[PDB]
Design a protein around this ligand. Structure first.
Ligand SMILES: *[C@@H]1O[C@H](CO)[C@@H](O[C@@H]2O[C@H](CO)[C@@H](O)[C@H](O)[C@H]2NC(C)=O)[C@H](O)[C@H]1NC(C)=O
Ligand SMILES: *[C@@H]1O[C@H](CO)[C@@H](O[C@@H]2O[C@H](CO)[C@@H](O)[C@H](O)[C@H]2NC(C)=O)[C@H](O)[C@H]1NC(C)=O
Ligand SMILES: *[C@@H]1O[C@H](CO)[C@@H](O[C@@H]2O[C@H](CO)[C@@H](O)[C@H](O)[C@H]2NC(C)=O)[C@H](O)[C@H]1NC(C)=O
Ligand SMILES: *[C@@H]1O[C@H](CO)[C@@H](O[C@@H]2O[C@H](CO)[C@@H](O)[C@H](O)[C@H]2NC(C)=O)[C@H](O)[C@H]1NC(C)=O
Ligand SMILES: C[C@@H](NCCCc1cccc(C(F)(F)F)c1)c1cccc2ccccc12
Ligand SMILES: C[C@@H](NCCCc1cccc(C(F)(F)F)c1)c1cccc2ccccc12
Ligand SMILES: N[C@@H](Cc1c[nH]c2ccccc12)C(=O)O
Ligand SMILES: N[C@@H](Cc1c[nH]c2ccccc12)C(=O)O
Ligand SMILES: *[C@@H]1O[C@H](CO)[C@@H](O)[C@H](O)[C@H]1NC(C)=O
Ligand SMILES: *[C@@H]1O[C@H](CO)[C@@H](O)[C@H](O)[C@H]1NC(C)=O
Ligand SMILES: *[C@@H]1O[C@H](CO)[C@@H](O)[C@H](O)[C@H]1NC(C)=O
Ligand SMILES: *[C@@H]1O[C@H](CO)[C@@H](O)[C@H](O)[C@H]1NC(C)=O
Ligand SMILES: *[C@@H]1O[C@H](CO)[C@@H](O)[C@H](O)[C@H]1NC(C)=O
Ligand SMILES: [Ca+2]
Ligand SMILES: [Ca+2]
Ligand SMILES: [Ca+2]
Ligand SMILES: [Ca+2]
Lengths: 803, 803
């Protein structure tokens, strides 16, 4: 009844089992020249035999214990799948022989042909899919220990499939979390071309696309990939700059690629291993460690089966009548031949040979096999202890254990809730899945043995909230097996401050160019997509990483030039005040009485007014400061000129009013300009990019020009009268002064436009304040220095009458 | 045995058949409260029954024709799959009952049914995978007509699977070609969660990422997706700006989402339908044309089966004894209930009256595939029949006995099959059991006459062409979204412009970008650009940053309002100096001119000539020869003038020797400065970025400073020697006039310091060409004015009048 090599025992209820005892089938090409024969299997699987023994041990433990299924013995019929759909399908056809016989009406034997109540499912997800398609026809519940494909959660197609292993959605999310944790964004993916690698790679692709992770390459491999595809994938890996490779595959499918990569000696790659090969003895070979060393993988939660190791050590080909795979196990363990290659004596010790069979540190899928067997057993017990009237069937009817059927066991397995030997609650959700934690391991080299050790470096809590599932202790991770520094696996290096991201055409967003910011903008953060513009009166620092205020530039009172000009003007005001004091003190003197005593007082008052008005130009330019800047000096200077002309007006109450009339025109022009186009406070920043120049535009230039021309007119009118008086030195020869006053005014303000009409910053104010001070000082000196010297420094020479 | 309803005919050779006569199973909630009864099917599939009739017609035509398998009749055993794995697996168990009895050795019915030797395959790719897993166990060939998944090309798993339909790799490549043809880069993808949609959308993902197409979303749908999943898919669809949605699905799995989208009235989307639902009656209903109208899809090559339509029209529930589905076909067509409230089927109705997809077709595409699969099996059988011994395909050149043929021999002959179909083309399966074929491209329109959706051919796909030339599309025949004739826009962002660049948006793919404007000095001219280009020197970016123009050259020259005035003033000065020379030359034999010196005055006049001429050296564009002597020219000339003028004072021919000695040191230092480090025409571009100044350097700046210092010291010495001589009225008090000349020169060459230091550019030569001639005028119009005016108009007031 099916394959010759089997492990079967009799009992009241028979449970089927499918384990990979070989890694695959012989690669003999069927040319169909002769009728095809059964294809042999090649490489023994000690781990798979351990899984089979876990199933057998669980069933024997159940039978020994009288508290679970009293007066009912459990049987089994376990076959070898060789990781192939064909072998497992032959075994499954053996399993459903009675169900198919009765459904197909082909009986038109009963004691023989035992009926399988439940099947402990396959390892591979494709194998489990193929088996479940046939098993769901008859509603035989199938509990898998290792198939973690999310495609088996579809209960519309797989009506009777449950599993004691978490499906791969959480594992793909966990790999995405691992990549996000180490700040990687340039990765490549490799997956097996089966129902396991493809959905997991797809889920990882979705998760990583969410987290702004860029996948450089994505290739598919298989156990039967020929030289061309393996070479192509090797070249794809070699060309890629991504160091982190995410692999969703098993051992047998990844073996050819790893062998080729070792042959071509590709090093420096970081491998993110799925659970199927993270603990695989096919790839964790020491000779491959220079390639696959430092692999970060996933491992399920380890379980505790108390008397399991003794059961494993007790296997013997002669004393294992029920287990048929024991003979081949002995032959492959001790490298001999059994007769019912040397001849095995049958007295060897399995502890003297190193194999995965007993040289294990954690039971992960073995505990899953145990849990699946115990789940079926507990469902059967729930059937047995059903109190009538409270059943799960129609009208609360309870099934009979003496005539139980597969669909009733399946119904009870859906509503199953029991506690395992580790105290945890074992329950299948609406999709038949069994959620569980993940462990995180790293591949190291054992210094004492030279083999590969799996060092736990973290875990993955599936019961935590999003973003709190992953914990990694990076201090325990040896990158590439030797290093202690986190590798760089970004497409491009980060852009520093003052630099932005530039697009590389035809490449993902993770690959960019660093472009310096323009001089008008800045960028402070690392890896910024744009340079923020410097706002308001700010400018960019020489490295465009900060904003620096645009310097406001002006003639300050505290500035050295401003200090000098203010002190010089104050000294002039003090000097004219002193001259006034001497004049009033010595008012009773014929020399002063000879000149216009009262009018000279108005002249010197206007002189002091001009000296003070010179201080208007220096300082902070406000609207009021430069509103009365030009016209204050205008009126003061025209008043001084009018006073000088009237004092010299010897050719003529009639003098003070004449001066008032002369200054009335100037005051009228000034007030007309003020009411029409008042000067404003310019804020000129568009002269130097980094400097703000605060000036004061005169509003309408025509009014200022007209005022200046008018002042020149009242200067030239006095100049003509002064010129003719050079031959008449009557009042102590004042012709040499009045001519000199107009001359120095004209010279100072004619020798100053090249200095004036050259600057438009702050020197345009200092130069013109210097011009005002110089003209006023010249006027003061010429008019009053000689007169005050004659009055004071010449007391004896104080002649009563002049010429 | 097996399914109750079936089509069955007895013969020497029996062919299995799997057709989806129903669209699915009844949505029954299996609570397992009662023993699970066989689930029933609900919706009828007239296309599936047409396919079944195609198989039956092919077998009947083969039997009638004596040129194919003479003296041998073909039987069939055809079952309904209802698009479900379970029903097809029941049918496959019926198919392999005999083989599996032989293998299981359960025979420990003599002829329950003649052994099935071939099975014309299923429709769904998952259903075909499930059936092929079981059929490959017994090496029973399976020729599918519709399963086009690339997973079935794996001959390591599917040993006996062949198909008359091409796999979907070419169709996904064709979707990528269509997307790139209309220049889209922002598309969404929807696939069916089965073995057809998933690998197809994965191949499309690979191809689209190869062509720089960005996929926005990627969702999976199913016939049994609940309301939550459909709702989430709908919000994902309408939360996106991608207008093109590429769908790899069938009619049943896409119906729920389409119905929901119609319910929520989402319009404007472009549908890229795969072959499975491009012609689906489930989706092509007129109610949905406002959503799925204007769909661009794929279709295979239609084939011509001559007498097929008559065979379809000849169906009858009472004359078709072999066909068991004919009764249900009649019931579903005429909406009645045949004898064993709906009316009673009299059996005299006309099938041509009712509009069902049965005979209402325009192109047999999968029906031709069914016909071709049957004929492929028949031709392999014929090849077995007409084999001459010694020229066979088996071990010793032998071949099988057709009277006892086995399924594996038929499979072997099908691998090496090469025959010509009725249409005259070669039918052969490659190493993967695949038939390569062309694709057609159709568009969903609306028929104004009937309202039904019509599939208008708008292109094709040529899989026998070189890569890149496979796609051909006639856009003028495409009605976009069913009404519009404008190609839709489905890019993530609008394209940039010329004077702008691309800006990275963080978290969005490379197809989504900003349009940051290029900064000043850099330009771009392409439609889109990832970086701003900068042209080389002598060029600056335009006002729109599109192109960059020549950096205009700024310097002092002629033919401008400033240069013309300066050269006019220079020629005026040379004119008055020539006039003065003529006055001194004509009236040379007079005592007046022979007051200071009769000949040294001529040397001074020549020096003034040279000083005036040196002013034109500063007005030209600085060349090598220009300003290597421009400053030396004025230096030497003015030193000569001062050397003449201080000797011109009397009581100092030793005068010429003294003048030459004074000028010799200046000439020597000028020659030394010129030879050691000559000033060079330096190209200046640092003051203003948009324009370039052509200035010239000075070489040894300290040499120039020393030259001007020597000149000013000599002038100061001349002024000092005339400082204490204004009393004597020698030669009409020339001491006062030389004092005036020296003072004028000093004010002109001391008042330009702020102009020189502040302003840099073209107005550095202008301030020189206005000061040089001003100082020269002061020297000329003061020293010689007192003599030219004396002897110009007056009766020369002389003969030692004041000498
Ligand atoms: C590689 O790129 C990632 C981005 O994908 C960088 O991660 C960023 O790191 C900075 C500071 O370390 C964080 O402020 C960002 O939030 C991170 N971005 C993301 C998306 O998480 C990582 O730093 C880069 N590594 C190197 C070496 O440059
Ligand atoms: C799954 O992993 C989580 C996280 O490691 C485990 O939660 C821990 O449980 C132990 C014992 O109950 C506590 O002492 C710790 O404080 C928990 N850590 C947490 C909550 O972060 C959990 O026990 C594991 N197993 C299950 C079945 O949840
Ligand atoms: C597939 O499509 C191509 C192109 O549409 C077909 O090639 C045409 O073949 C006919 C005759 O067979 C020629 O008259 C045309 O000029 C061809 N068109 C081309 C090359 O563009 C081809 O016949 C179709 N079928 C197959 C099986 O290849
Ligand atoms: C959508 O984007 C694509 C590419 O992102 C644009 O296609 C480009 O079109 C221009 C001119 O038609 C060609 O020169 C390029 O070679 C095309 N690029 C590619 C990758 O094919 C398309 O024009 C855009 N459509 C818009 C903006 O409406
Ligand atoms: C202080 C000045 N306001 C603008 C200066 C224009 C200027 C700058 C440089 C040179 C010259 C000048 F040569 F034309 F004088 C004018 C001012 C205000 C009011 C009356 C004035 C009368 C005479 C002179 C200046 C006057
Ligand atoms: C033409 C003139 N070259 C100006 C040099 C810099 C400068 C620019 C503006 C002002 C001054 C100065 F006031 F300091 F002189 C110097 C020059 C050439 C050779 C000899 C000269 C002797 C006297 C004056 C000018 C002389
Ligand atoms: N999960 C894998 C099977 C698997 C899990 N762990 C393993 C360890 C070894 C071998 C296979 C496995 C699958 O679905 O195919
Ligand atoms: N190609 C589809 C089957 C298919 C083709 N055309 C169809 C039309 C209707 C229904 C199904 C189909 C698959 O792989 O499964
Ligand atoms: C990888 O690199 C090799 C050698 O540089 C080159 O021939 C090949 O085209 C590249 N790409 C792939 C996919 O192999
Ligand atoms: C392979 O590469 C490693 C570098 O890690 C080097 O140590 C070793 O010698 C190489 N071996 C061969 C056979 O190239
Ligand atoms: C869709 O967008 C709305 C608002 O525009 C938001 O509330 C909702 O969460 C989004 N859903 C999805 C699936 O994007
Ligand atoms: C659906 O939308 C179309 C156009 O977008 C409109 O003509 C029609 O009336 C709408 N129907 C309903 C029921 O909203
Ligand atoms: C099939 O046979 C024809 C001859 O009729 C030949 O031209 C063609 O090459 C053959 N095809 C193959 C794949 O051998
Ligand atoms: Ca028990
Ligand atoms: Ca690319
Ligand atoms: Ca025939
Ligand atoms: Ca994103």
């Amino acid at each position: 009844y099916g394959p010759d090599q089997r492990a079967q025992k009799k009992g009241d209820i028979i449970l089927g089992g499918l384990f990979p005892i070989h890694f695959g089938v012989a690669a003999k090409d069927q040319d169909l020249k002769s009728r095809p024969e059964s294809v042999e299997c090649i490489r023994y699987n000690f781990r798979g035999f351990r899984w089979l023994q876990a199933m057998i041990f669980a069933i024997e433990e159940i039978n020994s214990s009288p508290a679970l299924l009293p007066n009912l013995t459990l049987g089994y019929r376990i076959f070898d799948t060789c990781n192939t759909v064909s072998k497992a399908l032959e075994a499954t056809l053996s399993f459903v022989a009675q169900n198919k016989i009765d459904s197909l009406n082909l009986d038109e034997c009963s004691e023989h042909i035992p009926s399988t109540i439940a099947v402990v499912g396959a390892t591979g997800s494709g194998v489990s899919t193929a088996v479940a398609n046939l098993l769901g026809l008859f509603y035989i519940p199938q509990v898998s220990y290792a198939s973690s494909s999310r495609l088996l959660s579809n209960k519309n197609q797989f009506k009777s499939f449950l599993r004691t292993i978490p499906n791969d959605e959480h594992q793909a999310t966990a790999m995405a979390d691992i990549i996000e944790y180490f700040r990687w964004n340039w990765v490549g993916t490799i997956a097996a071309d089966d129902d396991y690698g493809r959905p997991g790679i797809e889920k990882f692709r979705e998760e990583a696309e969410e987290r702004d992770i860029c996948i450089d390459f994505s290739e598919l491999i298989s156990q039967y990939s020929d030289e061309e595809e393996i070479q192509h994938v090797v070249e794809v890996i070699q060309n890629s700059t991504a160091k982190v490779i995410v692999v969703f595959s098993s051992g047998p499918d990844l073996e050819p690629l790893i062998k080729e990569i070792v042959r071509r000696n590709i090093t420096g790659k970081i491998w993110l291993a799925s659970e199927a090969w993270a603990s695989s003895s096919l790839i964790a070979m020491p000779q491959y460690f220079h390639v696959v060393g430092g692999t970060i993988g996933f491992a399920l939660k380890a379980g505790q089966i108390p008397g399991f190791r003794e059961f494993l050590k007790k296997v013997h080909p002669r004393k294992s009548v029920h287990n048929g795979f024991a003979k081949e196990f002995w032959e492959e363990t001790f490298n001999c031949h059994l007769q019912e290659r040397p001849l095995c004596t049958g007295d060897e010790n399995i502890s003297s040979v190193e194999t995965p069979y007993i040289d294990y540190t954690h039971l992960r899928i073995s505990y899953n096999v145990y849990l699946a067997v115990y789940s079926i057993a507990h469902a059967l017990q729930d059937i047995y202890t059903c109190l009538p009237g409270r059943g799960l069937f129609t009208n609360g009817s309870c099934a009979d254990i003496k005539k139980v059927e597969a669909w009733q066991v399946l119904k009870h397995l859906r509503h199953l809730n029991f506690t395992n030997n580790m105290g945890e609650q074992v329950t299948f959700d609406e999709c038949g899945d069994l959620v569980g934690n993940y462990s995180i391991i790293n591949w190291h080299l054992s210094p004492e043995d030279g083999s590969i050790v799996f060092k736990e470096v973290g875990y993955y809590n599936v019961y935590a909230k999003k973003g709190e599932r992953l914990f990694i202790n990076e201090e325990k991770i040896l990158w590439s097996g030797f290093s202690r520094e986190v590798p760089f696996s970004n497409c491009s290096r980060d852009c520093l401050a003052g630099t932005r991201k530039g697009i590389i055409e035809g490449e993902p967003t993770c690959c960019f160019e660093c472009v310096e910011c323009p001089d008008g903008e800045y960028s402070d953060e690392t890896d910024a997509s744009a340079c923020n513009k410097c706002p308001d009166d700010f400018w960019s620092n020489e490295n465009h990483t900060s904003c620096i205020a645009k310097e406001i530039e002006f003639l300050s009172w505290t500035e050295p030039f401003g200090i000098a000009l203010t002190l010089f003007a104050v000294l002039g005001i003090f000097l004219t005040a002193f001259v006034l004091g001497v004049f009033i003190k010595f008012r009773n003197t014929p020399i002063v009485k000879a000149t216009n005593r009262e009018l000279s007082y108005l002249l010197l008052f206007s002189l002091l007014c001009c000296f003070s008005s010179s201080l208007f130009f220096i300082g902070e330019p406000q609207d009021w400061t430069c509103r009365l800047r030009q016209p204050a000096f205008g009126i003061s200077f025209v008043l001084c000129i009018s006073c000088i002309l009237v004092k010299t007006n010897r050719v003529l109450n009639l003098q003070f009013l004449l001066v008032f009339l002369c200054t009335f025109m100037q005051i009228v022009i000034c007030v007309i300009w003020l009411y029409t186009a008042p000067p404003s406070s310019y804020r000129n920043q568009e002269l130097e990019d980094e400097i703000i120049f605060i000036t004061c535009h005169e509003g309408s230039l025509m009014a200022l020009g007209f005022l200046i021309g008018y002042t020149c007119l009242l200067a030239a009118i006095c100049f003509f009268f002064a010129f003719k008086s050079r031959k008449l030195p009557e009042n102590f020869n004042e012709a040499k002064f009045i001519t000199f006053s107009m001359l120095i005014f004209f010279i100072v303000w004619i020798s100053f436009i090249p200095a004036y009409a050259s600057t438009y910053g702050k020197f345009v104010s200092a130069v013109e304040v210097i011009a005002i001070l110089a003209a006023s000082f010249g006027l003061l000196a010429c008019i009053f220095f000689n007169k005050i010297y004659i009055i004071l420094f010449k007391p004896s020479r104080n002649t009563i009458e002049e010429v």
